[PDB]
Structures are given as C-alpha cells and as structure tokens.
C-alpha cells in the first residue's frame, strides 16, 4: 500500500470523476506520458506510476524471483489502486503495460471500465498459425547482445523502436533505456517473451481500444487484428496516421486525439 505509492513514484494529477491510469512500457518511465498528459488533466483524474523495472525506481526493489511473471506486476497495479481507494477507472497501457492491463481487467472486472492498449501484443513469438513477429533464434541473439554490450544494444534499438525519424524522441527513449539496469532490462524482456496471453483474451469484459500505428517493430498489423478478434469486450482498432512503437513520444498530439475520444465515456 502506502510504501508502494512511494516506491513506484505514484502521482495523481488533474481532477474528475473519470479516473485514468497511465501505465508505461519497456524502457521508459511515467515521464513518457508528459506530452499527452496536458490533454487529459482538465477532464480526468490521472494516476501515473513507474513499473518496478523502470530506471527511475531504485533497482534494489526489483525482486527477480517475484517478477518472473506478469501477475506480480498486476499485483502492484492493483495494490496502488486499492491504496488510492479508486473503485473504477480507465486504463491506458503501453507495451508490457497493455499485457498487465489485460490481466488486471480479468482479475478485477469491477475496477477496469475501459482499456486503451498502445503497442500491444498478446504474444511476441511466432507459433503455428500465429504470427507474433519474432523467432526464438532471433531473440536469443538479442538477449545475448543485451548482456554482452547493453549500451551498444540500446543505442541500436532506440531508433528502431521509435521508427519514425524523430531525433528528440530517439534521444528521450534512449535516456530512459540507458537508465534501466541491464540485468533488469534483460529479465523483463525474458519474462515478456515467455508470456502468452492468447488464451485469456476472451476473459476480458471491458471495452477496449487497440491503438495501432502504421508500422510497429514489436507489433505486426495482424496482431492488432488478432486482439480485435479475440478480446472479450467491445473492441475497436484505432489506426494512428504515423509509424512507431512509442507514439506517446513521437506523435503525442495525434495520440492525444485518440485518447480523448476513447476516454470520453466509460
Ligand atoms: C521487441 C524487443 C523488446 N521488446 C519488449 C520487451 C519487453 C517488454 C515489451 C517490449 C516491447 O517491445 O514493447 C525488447 C528487447 C528487444 C526486442 N527485440 O525487438 O528483439
């Protein structure tokens, strides 16, 4: 509870009866929301927090055993909302936080009135008749690079993830990626790559907006379609008219339009 609010840098800003949680992805912290935030705070009470793996959290809180599955990140989210006494919210999750929000919405359907998923996938690895975008041998090599030379890996990865040639966004994403402890960064990647949410998507009861960009290195277009086909609530796909995996960094004004629409009623 209380200690958790401090450890994970929880901030509540804005005001309103429509509560929105913004939950960041891999390689960033809650500062990734800074350019979308002013579009939301007149209208909504906004809860921000850092995942335990963020470089902005003291890394000695990272318990490798506890956080070897996403359910432990879910537990942290739920503990924060319970400590804040929030009974109902919308949840916006990027990347791993999209996965966390799917799981959280199944655990606590009363609490999650709507999900907005950005850069989201239920499964990165390819399977029989499922295209996730990644092969085992490919990711084995990346995980080796992450260990052998984290800094060179991160330098190469940041522009690929941003996608669009937006140097300020590359610099900003790099800043936070370099802030992650290397062993923690590898462990979150391993944990996410072993996660497969396909079977539980139909348990989601909340309406969902899947935000998809025109090219996302982590998320093939067919994954967005899979989510629309299999999530259990009323689901739509909103296509942004720019590319990248981190549109909150690279195209925040455009993303804010989608968020205002998705968060209007729930
Ligand atoms: C896709 C990927 C990621 N991605 C993640 C890892 C964990 C959580 C979310 C993500 C994500 O893309 O949102 C990290 C390192 C290396 C690679 N890769 O392309 O080889």
CB-ligand 1 contact for 25 (6 Å cutoff): yes
Entry resolution (Å): 1.3
End-to-end CA distance of the chain: 27
Ligand 1 centre from 56 Cα, in Å?
19
Looking at residue 71, which CATH number applies to its domain?
3.40.50.1820
Point out the annotated binding site for substrate.
95, 189, 245
Q: Which residue has the tokens 């809650």?
A: 30
Of 119, 111, 125, residue with least CA distance to 211: 119
Here the tokens at position 127 are 């399977």
CB burial of residue 126 (10 Å; 0-12, 13-18, 19+): middle
How big is the chain, counted in residues?
266
C-alpha dist (Å) from residue 145 to 152, 154, 170, 186, 260: 8, 9, 20, 10, 39
CB-ligand 1 contact for 132 (6 Å cutoff): no
Of 16, 23, 19, 29, residue with least CA distance to 178: 29
Count of the separate structural domains present in the chain = 1
Of 67, 65, 42, residue with least CA distance to 57: 67
Atom of ligand 1 nearest to the CA of 191: 7
How does DSSP classify residue 27? T
Which of 152, 189, 211 has most ligand 1 atoms within 8 Å of CB, for mutation? 189
C-alpha dist (Å) from residue 83 to 2, 3, 80: 7, 10, 5
Ligand 1 centre from 234 Cα, in Å?
27
Neighbours of 1 (CB within 10 A): 9
DSSP 81-133: HHHTT---EEEEEETHHHHHHHHHHHH-TTTEEEEEEES--S--B-BTTB--S
Of 38, 51, 60, residue with least CA distance to 9: 51
CB-ligand 1 contact for 70 (6 Å cutoff): no
Here the tokens at position 135 are 């092969």
Which of 140, 142, 174 has most ligand 1 atoms within 8 Å of CB, for mutation? 142
Domain that holds residue 154: 1-266
């Amino acid at each position: 509870g209380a200690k958790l609010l401090q450890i994970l840098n929880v901030r509540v800003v804005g005001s309103g009866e429509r509560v929105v949680v913004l939950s960041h992805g891999f390689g960033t912290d809650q500062s990734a929301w800074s350019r979308v935030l002013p579009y939301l705070t007149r209208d909504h009470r906004v809860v921000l927090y850092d995942l335990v793996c963020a470089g902005s959290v003291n890394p000695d809180h990272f318990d490798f055993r506890r956080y070897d599955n996403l359910d432990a990140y879910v537990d942290d989210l739920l503990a924060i909302l319970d400590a804040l006494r929030i009974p109902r919210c919308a949840f916006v999750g990027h990347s791993v936080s999209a996965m966390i929000g799917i799981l959280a919405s199944i655990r606590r359907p009363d609490l999650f009135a709507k999900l907005v998923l950005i850069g989201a996938s239920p499964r990165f690895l390819n399977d029989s008749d499922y295209h996730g975008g990644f092969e085992l041998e490919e990711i084995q090599q990346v995980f080796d690079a992450m260990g052998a030379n984290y800094s060179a890996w991160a330098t190469g990865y940041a522009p690929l993830a941003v996608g669009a040639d937006v140097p300020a966004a590359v610099q900003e994403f790099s800043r936070t990626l370099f802030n992650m402890r290397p062993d923690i960064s590898l462990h979150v990647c391993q944990t996410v790559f072993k996660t497969d949410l396909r079977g539980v998507l139909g348990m989601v009861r909340a309406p969902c907006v899947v935000v998809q960009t025109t090219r996302d290195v982590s998320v093939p277009a067919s994954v967005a379609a899979y989510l629309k086909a299999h999530l259990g609530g009323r689901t739509t796909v909103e296509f942004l008219q720019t590319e990248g995996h981190l549109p909150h960094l690279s195209a925040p004004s455009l993303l804010a339009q989608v968020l205002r629409r998705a968060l209007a009623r729930y």
